[PDB]
Amino acid sequence: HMKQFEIVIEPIQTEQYREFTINEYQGAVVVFTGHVREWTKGVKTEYLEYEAYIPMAEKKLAQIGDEINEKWPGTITSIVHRIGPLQISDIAVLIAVSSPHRKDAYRANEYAIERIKEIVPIWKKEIWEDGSKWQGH
Amino acid sequence: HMKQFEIVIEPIQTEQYREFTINEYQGAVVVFTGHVREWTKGVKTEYLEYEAYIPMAEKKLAQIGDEINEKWPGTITSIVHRIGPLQISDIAVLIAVSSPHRKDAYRANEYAIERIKEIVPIWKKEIWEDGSKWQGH
Amino acid sequence: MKVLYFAEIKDILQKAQEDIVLEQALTVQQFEDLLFERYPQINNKKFQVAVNEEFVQKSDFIQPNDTVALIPPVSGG
Amino acid sequence: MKVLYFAEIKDILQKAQEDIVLEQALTVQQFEDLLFERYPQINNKKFQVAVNEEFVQKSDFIQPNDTVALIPPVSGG
């Protein structure tokens, strides 16, 4: 069951978020995916564990949608973040923004990812060979 | 058969372009899709017909890839444009850019769409009730 | 009152939730005083508090049947 | 020499390609003179010329076995 703003545990299925945002007035869709990287530290990252306070996280993703609507009217936004264990190159987050014209779709999308990092109650833990650490910010 | 830079006639299958650009060093992918809009004129748009000088168009898309590599090293780019008849909301163009960090992926992607409109030999014809017109620029 | 724990605090307390029966409203400051008394091992941890899925301040009130969550510094995206 | 037509020019000429046998190299200007002589109905149309899939100028040369394409103002993306 897909919602406009949601937290999922299964791998993100990307096409449905673009499809949600599309209609006959929209000429541009920008879809950002954030992926788990390897080699950000000296010790290899085995995988990440994400957690969320899901109902508050979904309410804060919708808030960002509402902020976007206020700043770039005409856009449509859909956002998902995945939780649980994520492997290297798994999509952790996806943001889809549609717009009649491209510039607002790019701007709104980049705004969204910034806000997610600021306000949404989601946390990552990095796991490596004989260790793990919750990340902050 | 998928190429990094290609012209297709079948509907664009989006997931393969993101997948082409992903590897363990990339933490961001930006995928732009350009879609056929309705109601840009007073008379309803029935559909569009796109044409391309395909081998030159594919060479010019690769050129843009090379330009992107020169300006934003670390990015990986894949581009497809569709030709033939396109219906309302069909994807006409897709650009996928991966990067270790998001900012270059957004910048490079927006650069790509600008260049496609500038240099790539592809043309659209708008078709409406009792008329049609090749578009310029 | 239901109390929800996340991320490092969850790991430290070895529990994701607990119930604290309340007879009356409690200040957010009072809630933190109680929490740090019970669990001195988190008393230097940084977090915001949410009550019924909204961020609150230390001067706000918690009602007996509220859900209260400790929100450490976020790291999504 | 193979000549390729696209978009409105293609529509006007009612053909997508043609062969013009050449015994010797031709200037791009000469090619355009010939084209406009044959097809006065395109003589006010704007286009670039590509030879073997590269944009050329009017002072360039076309070899007998080249592929030449008329590229009207582009409208992709």
**Domain range summary for chain C, segments of one domain joined by +:** 1-77
Residues, chain B, total?
137
Tokens of D31: 């090619």
Is residue A52 within 8 A of residue A92, CB to CB? The reply is no
Domains of chain B: 1-137 (3.90.1170.40)
- Residues 6+ away with beta carbon under 8 Å from D30: none
Q: What is the resolution of this structure in A?
A: 2.0
> Do D74 and B122 make contact, defined as CB atoms within 8 angstroms?
yes
- Residues 6+ away with beta carbon under 8 Å from A2: A16, A20
The neighbouring-strand residues paired with A77 are A97
* Burial class of residue B84 in the structure, from the number of CB atoms within 10 Å of its CB (0-12 exposed, 13-18 middle, 19+ buried): middle
> Do B37 and A29 make contact, defined as CB atoms within 8 angstroms?
no
Contacts of A117 in chain C (CB under 8 A): 74-77
Tokens of A58: 């979904």
Tokens of B24: 């363990």
- Residues 6+ away with beta carbon under 8 Å from D64: D1, D21, D22, D23, D24, D25
**How far apart, in whole angstroms, are the C-alpha atoms of residue D53 and residue B76?**
25
**How far apart, in whole angstroms, are the C-alpha atoms of residue B4 and residue B17?**
8
The domain at D1-77 falls in which architecture? Roll (3.10)
> Do C77 and A56 make contact, defined as CB atoms within 8 angstroms?
no
Question: By C-alpha distance, which of A79, A115, A114, A84 is closest to A94?
Answer: A79
Give the chain D residue nearest B122 (alpha carbons): D76
> Do B121 and D73 make contact, defined as CB atoms within 8 angstroms?
no
**C-alpha pair distances (Å), B77 with each of A62, B74, B94, B95, B109:** 31, 10, 11, 7, 8
Crossing angle for the helix pair A54-71 and A102-119, nearest 10 degrees? 150
**How far apart, in whole angstroms, are the C-alpha atoms of residue B49 and residue C8?**
57
Tokens of A51: 């957690």
Crossing angle for the helix pair B102-119 and A102-119, nearest 10 degrees? 180
Binding positions of A are: 35-37, 45, 101-102, 117, 124-126
SS3 content of chain B, % helix, strand, coil (to 5): 30, 35, 30
Count chain A–chain B contacts defined by CB atoms under 8 A: 89
**How far apart, in whole angstroms, are the C-alpha atoms of residue D1 and residue D68?**
7
